[PDB]
């Protein structure tokens, strides 16, 4: 397994193309009926920084599959989620974080060096779009219903 380069993303296309995570339908709030597709992820093998556990199923799957890949990769190191669904603001419009289809992740030890390989693991985990967004975190996302 070869790590992802800084500021590199897979697939090598725009996130909201059909090849990646697909188009963006709209922001998901609570008074919006579509809020029912979002459900908490109580995986004990994942660290939530912190309603940060709410997310779509395809996201839950890909994320749960990744949680294993991490501790399988490093000794006693878990998968850490810094941001998931955004209940309001904190993001630019049309961000998949508004649809619970996106997640920002790091390792438990905050070892920025591992981040490169982490992204790769997320790619093989089946994430529809992974992106080495910055030194501080990786951004992953999936498609919807």
């Amino acid at each position: 397994l070869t790590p992802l380069a800084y500021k590199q993303f897979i697939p090598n296309v725009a996130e909201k193309t059909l090849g990646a995570s697909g188009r963006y339908e709209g922001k998901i709030t609570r008074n919006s009926e579509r809020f029912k597709e979002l459900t908490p992820n109580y995986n004990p093998d994942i660290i939530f920084k912190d309603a940060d556990r709410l997310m779509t199923q395809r996201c839950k799957d890909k994320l749960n599959a990744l949680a294993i890949s991490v501790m399988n990769q490093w000794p006693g190191v878990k998968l850490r989620v810094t941001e998931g669904w955004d209940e309001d603001g904190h993001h630019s419009e049309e961000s998949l974080h508004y649809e619970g289809r996106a997640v920002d992740i790091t390792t438990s030890d905050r070892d920025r060096s591992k981040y490169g390989m982490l992204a790769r693991l997320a790619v093989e985990a089946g994430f529809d779009w992974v992106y080495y967004e910055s030194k501080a975190h990786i951004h992953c996302s999936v498609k919807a219903e």
């Binding site: 380069a5 920084k49 810094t82 993001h91 630019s92 920002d104 490169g116 030194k135 501080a136 975190h137």
Partner: protein
């Protein structure tokens, strides 16, 4: 013992800083907070028409560091007429933008706004600790000092599209013959040819820097350039040293010492002027109340000594001759520092004023359907090729000795026919 100041111009509109371009014209360009750059003749008069005017693009404010931040002329502006400006804009509180412009090839005293070419667009969450000071080094590369913008780690750890450039110094080679990119990265750079780090980053450790003094003639032999900054966040000063003939493999460390005493501090500078012989080589820093002081290290021991300098401040300036200026607060005016011990303009400081002339470079001359790099290369826009982008390029491209002329109209010589021959 004491220094004196003489007024030069009033009625200024929220000045922030002033500088020259090194082209003989001895024009003093004055940056204004709200997005204007006015010119001051060597005589002392202000032009009617602004050199630059982008008050619409720049979103400033009073208090709040937003607005026109800094501007730096290319070392060869006399030939290429290239300049670089940093400012805040918006539509996330705002954006710190760094762009390259080019003076009108018709009028040397005004820039062609169409020649805008964006290099960096830094995301900003707040309106403090922005920085944005532009400057060139003896190496020729462009430096960019950026404050931390108060972007905590948590912020950058749970937010997308954040700078990742804030709180550090950047190194960009603007002299490139490459077209696919706005600029290139020096091999000297630490993170050059890297796969895990931003090649632009030269060093980090900044927070809320004022105007950093740039000593271009360090008293050292190995150190060819040194930059001294004053932070306030606590409060201290940090300086970055640089060697010309050195290929960095790692990050240059910022020296964090504490020379100053207690109070705040607007900024500083190193006197390179001719007017004063005693002030020569001395670092000078002042605060918003006109309280100044001088700094000086030592070849041996390398200790710093602080001596008070006898005499609302908004910024400083430096003409071609090296003479420093003060900008205070249409209330706003420019002053000039003068050493009473010597004449205002000694017989040796005299200099013939060569007026700014039109760009006569080869690129500025015959370069169409593209732009000129600071090195003179004409980067063709899509649909063009050849030295100066005159050779039309079809889609699909012409085959069998086919020559493109009209929009995608190939041209097959005798014996051939078809859309692409």
């Amino acid at each position: 013992n004491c220094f004196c100041i003489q007024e030069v111009v009033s009625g200024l509109r929220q000045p922030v800083g002033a500088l020259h371009s090194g082209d003989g014209s001895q024009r003093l360009f004055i940056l204004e907070k709200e997005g204007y750059v006015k010119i001051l003749t060597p005589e002392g008069e202000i032009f009617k028409e602004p050199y630059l005017d982008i008050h619409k693009l720049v979103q400033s404010g009073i208090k709040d560091e937003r607005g026109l931040l800094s501007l730096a002329f290319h070392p060869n502006y006399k030939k290429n007429g290239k300049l670089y400006v940093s400012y805040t804009t918006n539509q996330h509180d705002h954006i710190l933008r760094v762009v390259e412009y080019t003076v009108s090839r018709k009028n040397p005293h005004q820039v062609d706004l169409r020649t805008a070419r964006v290099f960096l667009e830094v995301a900003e969450l707040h309106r403090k600790h922005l920085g944005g000071q532009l400057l060139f080094g003896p190496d020729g590369f462009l430096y960019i000092i950026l404050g931390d913008g108060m972007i905590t780690l948590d912020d950058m750890e749970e937010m997308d599209g954040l700078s990742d450039f804030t709180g550090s110094v950047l190194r960009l080679d603007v002299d490139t013959d490459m077209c696919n990119v706005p600029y290139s990265i020096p091999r000297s750079n630490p993170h050059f040819n890297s796969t895990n780090q931003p090649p632009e980053v030269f060093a980090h450790g900044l927070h809320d820097p004022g105007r950093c003094a740039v000593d271009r003639h360090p008293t050292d032999i190995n150190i060819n350039l040194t930059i001294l900054c004053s932070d306030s966040n606590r409060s201290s000063a940090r300086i970055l040293q640089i060697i010309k003939g050195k290929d960095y493999e790692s990050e240059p460390s910022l020296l964090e010492f504490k020379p100053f005493s207690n109070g705040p501090l607007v900024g500083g500078f190193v006197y390179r002027g001719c007017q004063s012989e005693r002030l020569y080589g001395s670092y000078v820093f002042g605060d918003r109340n006109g309280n100044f002081l001088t700094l000086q290290q030592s070849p041996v021991t390398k200790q710093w000594q602080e001596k008070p300098l006898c005499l609302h401040i908004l910024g400083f300036g430096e003409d071609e001759l090296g003479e420093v200026y003060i900008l205070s607060s249409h209330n706003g005016k420019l002053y000039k520092i003068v050493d009473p011990k010597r004449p205002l303009m000694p017989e040796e400081c005299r200099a013939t004023v060569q007026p700014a002339q039109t760009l006569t470079s080869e690129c500025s001359r015959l370069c169409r359907n593209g732009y000129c790099t600071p090195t003179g290369k004409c980067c063709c826009s899509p649909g063009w090729e050849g030295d100066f982008c005159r050779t039309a390029k079809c889609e699909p491209a012409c085959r069998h000795g086919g020559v493109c002329v009209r929009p995608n109209k190939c041209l097959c010589k005798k014996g051939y026919l078809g859309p692409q021959c």
